[PDB]
Amino acid sequence: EDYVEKSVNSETKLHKLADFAIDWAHNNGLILRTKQFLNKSDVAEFAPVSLLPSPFPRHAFEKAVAVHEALQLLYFRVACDYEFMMDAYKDVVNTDNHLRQLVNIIKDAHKQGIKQPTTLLIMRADYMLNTLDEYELKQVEVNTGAIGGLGIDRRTTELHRQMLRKVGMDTSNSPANNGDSNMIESLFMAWEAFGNKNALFVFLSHERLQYKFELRNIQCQLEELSNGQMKVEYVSLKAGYEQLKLGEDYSLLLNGEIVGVVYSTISALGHQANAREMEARRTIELSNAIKAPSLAIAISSSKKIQQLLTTPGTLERFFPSATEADKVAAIRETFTGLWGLEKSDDQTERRIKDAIENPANYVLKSNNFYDEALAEKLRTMPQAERASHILMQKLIPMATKNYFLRPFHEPKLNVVVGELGVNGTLLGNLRDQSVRHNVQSGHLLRTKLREGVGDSPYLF
Amino acid sequence: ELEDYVEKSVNSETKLHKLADFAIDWAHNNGLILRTKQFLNKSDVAEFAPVSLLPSPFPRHAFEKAVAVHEALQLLYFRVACDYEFMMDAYKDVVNTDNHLRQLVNIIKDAHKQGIKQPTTLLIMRADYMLNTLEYELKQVEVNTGAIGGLGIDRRTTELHRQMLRKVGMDTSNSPANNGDSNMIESLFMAWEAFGNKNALFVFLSHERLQYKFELRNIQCQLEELSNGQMKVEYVSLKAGYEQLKLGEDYSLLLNGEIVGVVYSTISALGHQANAREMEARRTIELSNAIKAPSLAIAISSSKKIQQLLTTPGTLERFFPSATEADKVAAIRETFTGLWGHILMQKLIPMATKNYFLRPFHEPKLNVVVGELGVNGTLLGNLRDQSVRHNVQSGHLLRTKLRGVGDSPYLF
Ligand SMILES: Nc1ncnc2c1ncn2[C@@H]1O[C@H](COP(=O)(O)OP(=O)(O)O)[C@@H](O)[C@H]1O
Ligand SMILES: Nc1ncnc2c1ncn2[C@@H]1O[C@H](COP(=O)(O)OP(=O)(O)O)[C@@H](O)[C@H]1O
Ligand SMILES: [Mg+2]
Ligand SMILES: [Mg+2]
Ligand SMILES: [Mg+2]
Ligand SMILES: [Mg+2]
Ligand SMILES: [Mg+2]
């Protein structure tokens, strides 16, 4: 399919469609704070997006959506398996102080005993298409720890349905995208589970952020759902050092008030936190607040754990019963090759040799090098760094054409590639590993120049 | 009274910023926005519409009076617009000193000589009132008929103010419903159907550089929804209209060769000082069979001179001759203050209150302020026989200045 080129047949049509889309974005809240004023909402720009929804195979979309609940159950169980988590991090700990401080928080939480059984896992699974013209769906990453912008994603779908109508195309191949509703319902469900209507709901978030309008949408809808009863607050880890305390009953206290939910948009793995920020993370973690997500759930989505999960028998540790072989198989077929660099087997040294000699087949990742950069990193890597890196099979994605809409850039025709993101939530119990609500809801396309922007799939 | 609840409800700089911060984010999330001053030709960035932090106190009696009289006020000005002899007489002297008004009246003269080609027209009116101090009486300051918009801004302002009221623990039932934007759209769609050709364009006669572009886009999307994707919309200015608008040999209005069924003006006939090319576009529009929202005669019926003439004894009774319509005449007349034949007007002394202004990049503070109540509506009429298909009041606003910004009433 190259319907985008077929549907946009002049510069006059390009500007008429772009102009409409930009105004639509502002009118429907598909917006971010400007880079110039990340601390201020006085002005806002539209979220960067494709002009039309990028073609995506229907089979691959259906596969990715279908496996998500089982994928969420997997990572929930991984997070709950203390012995597995400590073993996966035993080497990485010695070379990386950020990950050491985080694992020590989890160690301290485990030895004090868990004070709050209810937790909310929030996951995005990312996939690319890999070429065989037929394509297989393969998983690139899993993200737990800080998931947001689901309102941006829905609005992007809605925009694309409008754009499809404008160029005379059927909108039934644009799938429904209501993740933001699940986010809010799940967050509200978590707030009720705390069992104290005077307990605060806290957005653990940066002061300077593009996504502030998105968080405000969650706030308004949470307040509506609680009939004005839920008090909401915003705090960063920097400010949390002074403002968050652990009460003598293990309550989380924000300026002395009980907090019932901490919804993190500050990634535990992604955000390089200083010593004051880690002490706030610790305080949160040792408290009886429902965490969305808990630290153990946040750090379960590292590249090392992604790699370990591909080793035979490892998936079966979390799904031991023959009744769950269908989940194991469905997850396994979305994996491509991943390998660790830690040990001195002959299997690993041959893998390293293969990648040095044939680097176009690989991507080298830390907790990203390509081609001769990859071969050189492998040649010159110190003994210590081996454990903080994994080898992954290189995926060759489907290429299409599309226009990008970005603040203050003329749109033009680019060759582009998509990355499919599938979102969901799981509300669970850490003590007995039961599940109250495990759903897939919401998706996106992230589209880049091949040689990026928000996008949504048009299924074929 | 509830006359300084704003001061009572906002008792620190900390509370002021927490409320302001919430309101600004709410505005962007709900489309209470305008294009930036820096980039009036571009929608890439947008700022929030300037508004009061809380809804300004306004007497319930005065609001109810202004809303109640509106349909009769609309009927009055419709009938004024349709009375060619009255309009020419009101402008006979003014014409000789003012070239802008001369060109406009000459368009109406040329339309009258050719015979009017489209009987259906849509009057869009805002009546402005100030409170006058004695207790307060409601008095009319102005009537506006040639370019009315921003009713979506007004509704959203009401919605914002209901949110702010909840945040400071105040009852929202004294904030009246404000759904003028829906009437605007329904009335505009009604006008488009009355043309009787689903392939006919709907045209926003509008500036290219304007803060209100997002508002017009909202109307576009809702008109397209209401037509089930059938209505084609376009935008054109009078500058661009010189070359792009033509009068067809059957009196069709042609925008780049396509038939136009409705011309909705947001370029004021009295307010916008138009050049010679722009007046020829205005003429083309006016001589065509497009339904005009509003027609030029309706737009120029709302001059200060006509406002003044309407206060002279027996002049209201020209348009409402029957004893049966003396109740309308009396209800309209009690909202008039003194006017005499520019023109002399009696000075009104408005009610003062306190409020905070939210404006892009300026810290809010407590100001002494005065309000001006705007009441909106539409009338879909027939110029040939003077009949009326739809005459409703819908929508209002407060415009609040330092003794400005968008505001909404909190009734007491
Ligand atoms: N196996 C792979 N083959 C090809 N490209 C990849 C592969 N893995 C990652 N990439 C590219 O690199 C990008 C970033 O790396 P990723 O591992 O997803 O980490 P993160 O999203 O946390 O930065 C991906 O979005 C994708 O475009
Ligand atoms: N009779 C009056 N007494 C006091 N102020 C007036 C009077 N008439 C007009 N004003 C003030 O002048 C402003 C603008 O005048 P107006 O006649 O409404 O023209 P326009 O709104 O078309 O510019 C009003 O908003 C009001 O503040
Ligand atoms: Mg990624
Ligand atoms: Mg990850
Ligand atoms: Mg099964
Ligand atoms: Mg005025
Ligand atoms: Mg006037």
Per-residue DSSP letters for A349-409? HHHHHHHHH-GGGEEEEE--B-HHHHHHHHHH--TTGGGGEEEEEPP-PPEEEEEEEBTTB
Q: How far apart are alpha carbons A374 and A363 in whole angstroms?
A: 7
User: Which ligand neighbours the alpha carbon of B336 most closely?
Assistant: 2
Residue B70's contacts (CB-CB under 8 Å, 6 or more residues apart) are B125, B127, B375, B377, B393
Per the entry, the structure determination technique was: X-ray
Residue A357's contacts (CB-CB under 8 Å, 6 or more residues apart) are A375
Residue type, B49: A
Question: A166 to chain B: nearest residue by CA?
Answer: B229
Residue environment code for A252-281, b if the CB has 16+ CB neighbours within 10 A, otherwise e = bbbeeebbbbbbbbbbbbebebeeebbbbb
DSSP β-ladder status, B258-265 and B201-205: parallel
- Ligand 1 atom closest to the CA of A397, numbered from 1: 4
Q: How far apart are alpha carbons B117 and B120 in whole angstroms?
A: 9
Q: How far apart are alpha carbons B42 and A408 in whole angstroms?
A: 9
Strands (E), A84-218: 118-131, 135-143, 200-204
Task: Give the DSSP letter string of B7-58.
Answer: HHH--SHHHHHHHHHHHHHHHHHHT-EEE-GGGTT--SEEEEPPEESSPEEE
- Contact predicate B247/B288, CB 8 Å: yes
- Contact predicate A393/A130, CB 8 Å: no
Output the CA B141–ligand 2 centroid distance in Å: 6
Task: Give the DSSP letter string of A309-358.
Answer: TTSTTHHHHHS-SGGGHHHHHHHHTT---EEE-SS--HHHHHHHHHHHH-
Residues of chain A with C-beta less than 8 angstroms from the C-beta of B363: none
Q: How far apart are alpha carbons B33 and B49 in whole angstroms?
A: 5
- Please judge whether A23 and B214 are an interchain contact, meaning their C-beta atoms are less than 8 angstroms apart: yes
Residues of chain A with C-beta less than 8 angstroms from the C-beta of B43: 19, 22-23, 26, 46
Q: Is the dihedral of CA A102, A106, A112, A115 positive or negative?
A: positive
Residue B238's contacts (CB-CB under 8 Å, 6 or more residues apart) are B205, B267, B272, B274, B277, B278, B279, B281, B282
What resolution in angstroms, rounded to 1 decimal?
A: 2.6
A26: distance to nearest CA of chain B, Å?
Answer: 7
B3: distance to nearest CA of chain A, Å?
Answer: 26
- Please judge whether A26 and B46 are an interchain contact, meaning their C-beta atoms are less than 8 angstroms apart: yes
Output the CA A179–ligand 5 centroid distance in Å: 24
Question: Can you tell me whether residue B128 is helix, strand or coil?
Answer: strand
Query: Residue A379 is encoded by which pair of tokens?
Result: 């040649």
- Ligand 1 atom closest to the CA of A446, numbered from 1: 25
Output the CA B222–ligand 7 centroid distance in Å: 29
- Residues facing A425 on adjacent strands: A122, A439
Chain centroid to Cα B367, Å, comes to: 27
Output the CA B407–ligand 6 centroid distance in Å: 14
Q: Is the dihedral of CA A231, A234, A239, A241 positive or negative?
A: positive
Please compute, for residue B100, the number of CA atoms within 13 A of its CA located in the half-sphere on the CB side: 10
Find, among A49, A9, A74, A6, the residue nearest to A317 by Cα. A74
Question: Can you tell me whether residue A3 is helix, strand or coil?
Answer: helix
Q: What is the 3-state secondary structure (H, E, C) of A226-243?
A: CCCCCCEEEECHHHHHHH
Q: How far apart are alpha carbons B167 and A103 in whole angstroms?
A: 41
- Please judge whether B229 and A165 are an interchain contact, meaning their C-beta atoms are less than 8 angstroms apart: yes
Q: What is the CB neighbour count within 10 angstroms for residue B384? A: 12
Residue A17's contacts (CB-CB under 8 Å, 6 or more residues apart) are A8, A51, A163, A166, A167
Residue type, B47: E
| Residue A29 in contact with partner chain B when CB distance is under 8 A | yes
Q: How far apart are the first and last CA of chain B?
A: 7
Residue B387's contacts (CB-CB under 8 Å, 6 or more residues apart) are B381
Q: How far apart are alpha carbons B329 and B318 in whole angstroms?
A: 10
- Please judge whether B29 and A216 are an interchain contact, meaning their C-beta atoms are less than 8 angstroms apart: yes
- Contact predicate A279/A241, CB 8 Å: yes
Question: Can you tell me whether residue B372 is helix, strand or coil?
Answer: strand
Q: Is the dihedral of CA B51, B53, B58, B60 positive or negative?
A: positive
| Residue A224 in contact with partner chain B when CB distance is under 8 A | no
- Contact predicate A459/A56, CB 8 Å: yes
- Ligand 1 atom closest to the CA of A141, numbered from 1: 18
Find, among A126, A173, A72, the residue nearest to A443 by Cα. A126
Phi, psi of B230 (to 5 degrees): -90, -25
Find, among A252, A22, A316, A16, the residue nearest to A115 by Cα. A252
Q: Is the dihedral of CA A97, A103, A109, A112 positive or negative?
A: negative
- Contact predicate A295/A146, CB 8 Å: no
Would you list the domain boundaries of chain A? Answer: 3-336+395-459
- Contact predicate B153/B219, CB 8 Å: no
